[PDB]
Design a protein around this ligand. Structure first.
Ligand SMILES: [K+]
Ligand SMILES: [K+]
Ligand SMILES: [K+]
Ligand SMILES: [K+]
Ligand SMILES: [K+]
Ligand SMILES: [K+]
Ligand SMILES: [K+]
Ligand SMILES: [K+]
Ligand SMILES: [Mg+2]
Ligand SMILES: [Mg+2]
Ligand SMILES: [Mg+2]
Ligand SMILES: [Mg+2]
Ligand SMILES: [Mg+2]
Ligand SMILES: [Mg+2]
Ligand SMILES: [Mg+2]
Ligand SMILES: [Mg+2]
Ligand SMILES: [Mg+2]
Lengths: 114, 82, 177, 80
RNA sequence: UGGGCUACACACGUGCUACAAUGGGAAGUACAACGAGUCGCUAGACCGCGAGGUCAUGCAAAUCUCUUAAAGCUUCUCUCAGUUCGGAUUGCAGGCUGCAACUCGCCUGCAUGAAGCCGGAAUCGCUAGUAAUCGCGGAUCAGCACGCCGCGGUGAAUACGUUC
RNA sequence: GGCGGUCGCCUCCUAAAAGGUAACGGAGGCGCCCAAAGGUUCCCUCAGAAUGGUUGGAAAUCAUUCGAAGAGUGUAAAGGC
């Protein structure tokens, strides 16, 4: 549809774009302001001219598979050089100084009470 | 992080030791306690033995490490699982 | 016919020169292309094979032949005669049309595509291509698919060796690594 | 070829929407758009986002910066 | 000097934020009190998306400043969706304080967008300006709290009764 | 003698290159199955192995090559194909 993702047809454009990996709320507003598409129109109402303008606008940004490879390469590098952060990534522990005696469940996964 | 204006940080005693060796066909290990020091591009090719709290761990500085502190490659706590 | 046109006019004179073929009949040509979808999931649910066969037909344009297990295997929960697997054999024009779309439309849509393997030769000049996922073919509609599946594309040629098959396939269009 | 067992299959033209490149083939896919073709004929027109003449691998021409070396990244951030 | 006290298969205590529409988002508009301040509190202007930076101003202060409080009210929007709910985690880029923030800081932007759909047995607080909820100030303090101490805003339900 | 085993039928070895041939000799099967797994016409050739190949694994499907039978022949064995 836009970057290889069928954005929700019923939602307003600002939000529908957010379903693209690499587009958040602020970035969606920027691309619509550049193209000149009102933020309140449902994307089902987008005309081929408006959609292509959005696609042209989005093609400038790094999104979806391009972004995912970029971030994974960063983490890959941290692991390869053997940095402290890389080990945190590889062992599934918080990487930004958070204490692990408690919590850290997002990184660790579900509790293993054993 | 550290303000751009302040520039990157490295302890002068460590920076001196690397500077004394830049034009060296065969390098020798630089023993340091400066975990806080940033890895500059001039460190590439050196092995810097970084103190981790009880011993100097030899870290080989590959160009991919630039911008990281020497302490990021000398873990202080040992954990092998419970 | 475009690819067949390219083969008869451009490929054939070049391959004769490169390999020094005394007669034109020596020129390797694509004999057939067999697309095979090994669907072992038919055991758990028969309709997964049914949906697989539907998509396979749309990609090739021919109703596939539903292959069946020749032998019973307990590890796979497989009984002899169970319909697991489907294949299509494309010959003549329908083969060239498909090869053209594969080279010019399907392969570019492969996620993070860096070319097709170069060691995937059987040693006799037949190249088999492993498609990891569908939706690279324009016919799949990207929404009908419930389970993403791949396929084995076997390009059979009359080349006696891998080198000639490699050359033939390259000049016909093949993004070799 | 047997009758009434195969999916409908017709000659068609694919277009690369990134550059407008078009070629003639056959497909089971349909569309609501048709175009004329040389030699005096009309075929259904199918839209393709990327083809072999617009894909980075086939063309060889990229569109990004190939990342930034960390030594170069370090020197850029501080002008060394 | 460096490391540790911030280690993490796990168990518990006290909290904070949520699970949405009695809400989220945007715009507009109103009302406190207790307090703190000299190399400190900092107006105004300008730069920056922002954290903040820059020139510079008043005030040892019921005079100047922190400090135009948030809930609230009035319009617009979203329309029940793991969502425009939630904001964990991570990538990148920054801002500060500091000789230095890798182990171990706080904050900012962009991206990422986890669990969570109101919680088993059990258990806690509270009888009114109280509970509930909303912000604000202060001590320690270069920097750093969802803690602690204090402050005001909004503001309920119920108590037949003493068997347990 | 008892106990146990056996009692009819099929295949093998014993069985001494026709046939037959005993033992409480050595091994196995049968008391069915099939509406095609019968008849006929037409057509077909296996098991494995190597190599290549998405899910896919020693091994499920696909392709080529090699492969005289190392398969299969409903059900034991022999003979046969
Ligand atoms: K920690
Ligand atoms: K806890
Ligand atoms: K807390
Ligand atoms: K709790
Ligand atoms: K509202
Ligand atoms: K720190
Ligand atoms: K609870
Ligand atoms: K403080
Ligand atoms: Mg997004
Ligand atoms: Mg901490
Ligand atoms: Mg402690
Ligand atoms: Mg709900
Ligand atoms: Mg009381
Ligand atoms: Mg109060
Ligand atoms: Mg005799
Ligand atoms: Mg005899
Ligand atoms: Mg028979």
């Amino acid at each position: 549809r836009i970057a290889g993702v069928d954005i929700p047809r019923d939602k307003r454009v600002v939000v529908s774009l957010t379903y693209i990996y690499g587009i958040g709320n602020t970035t969606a507003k920027k691309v619509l302001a550049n193209v000149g598409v009102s933020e309140d129109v449902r994307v089902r109402d987008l005309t081929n001219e408006q959609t292509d303008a959005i696609r042209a606008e989005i093609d400038k940004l790094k999104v979806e598979g391009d972004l995912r490879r970029e971030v994974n390469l960063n983490i890959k590098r941290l692991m390869e050089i053997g940095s402290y952060r890389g080990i945190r990534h590889r062992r599934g522990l918080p990487t930004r100084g958070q204490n692990t005696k408690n919590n850290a469940r997002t990184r660790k996964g579900p509790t293993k009470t054993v | 992080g550290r303000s751009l204006k302040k520039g990157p940080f490295v302890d002068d005693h460590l920076m001196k030791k690397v500077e004394a060796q830049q034009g060296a066909e065969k390098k020798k290990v630089i023993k340091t306690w400066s975990r806080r020091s940033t890895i500059f591009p001039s460190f590439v090719g050196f092995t810097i033995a970084v103190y981790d709290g009880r011993k100097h761990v030899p870290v080989y500085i590959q160009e991919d490490m630039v911008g990281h502190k020497l302490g990021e490659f000398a873990p202080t706590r040992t954990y092998r699982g419970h | 016919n475009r690819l067949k046109e390219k083969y008869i006019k451009e490929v054939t004179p070049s391959l004769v020169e490169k390999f020094n073929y005394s007669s034109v009949m020596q020129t390797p040509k694509v004999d057939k292309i067999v697309i095979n979808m090994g669907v072992g999931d038919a055991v758990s649910n028969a309709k997964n094979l049914d949906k697989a066969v539907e998509e396979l037909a749309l990609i090739t344009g021919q109703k596939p032949l539903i292959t069946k297990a020749k032998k019973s295997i307990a590890g796979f929960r497989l009984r002899e005669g169970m319909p697991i697997g489907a294949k299509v054999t494309l010959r003549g024009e329908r083969m060239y049309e498909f090869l053209d779309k594969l080279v010019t439309v399907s392969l570019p849509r492969v996620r993070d595509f860096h070319g097709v393997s170069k060691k995937a030769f059987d040693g006799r000049g037949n190249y088999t291509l492993g498609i990891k996922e569908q939706l690279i073919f324009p016919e799949v509609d990207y929404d009908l698919v419930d389970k993403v599946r791949g396929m084995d594309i076997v390009i059979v040629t009359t080349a006696n060796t891998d080198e000639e098959s490699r050359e033939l396939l390259a000049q016909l269009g093949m993004p070799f690594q | 070829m047997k009758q009434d067992i195969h999916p409908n299959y017709q000659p068609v033209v694919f277009m690369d929407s990134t550059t407008g490149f078009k070629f003639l083939s056959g497909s089971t896919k349909g569309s609501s758009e048709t175009v004329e073709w040389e030699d005096g004929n009309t075929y259904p027109l199918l839209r393709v986002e990327v083809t072999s003449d617009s894909h980075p691998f086939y063309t060889g021409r990229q569109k990004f910066t190939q990342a930034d070396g960390r030594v170069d990244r370090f020197n850029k951030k501080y002008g060394l």
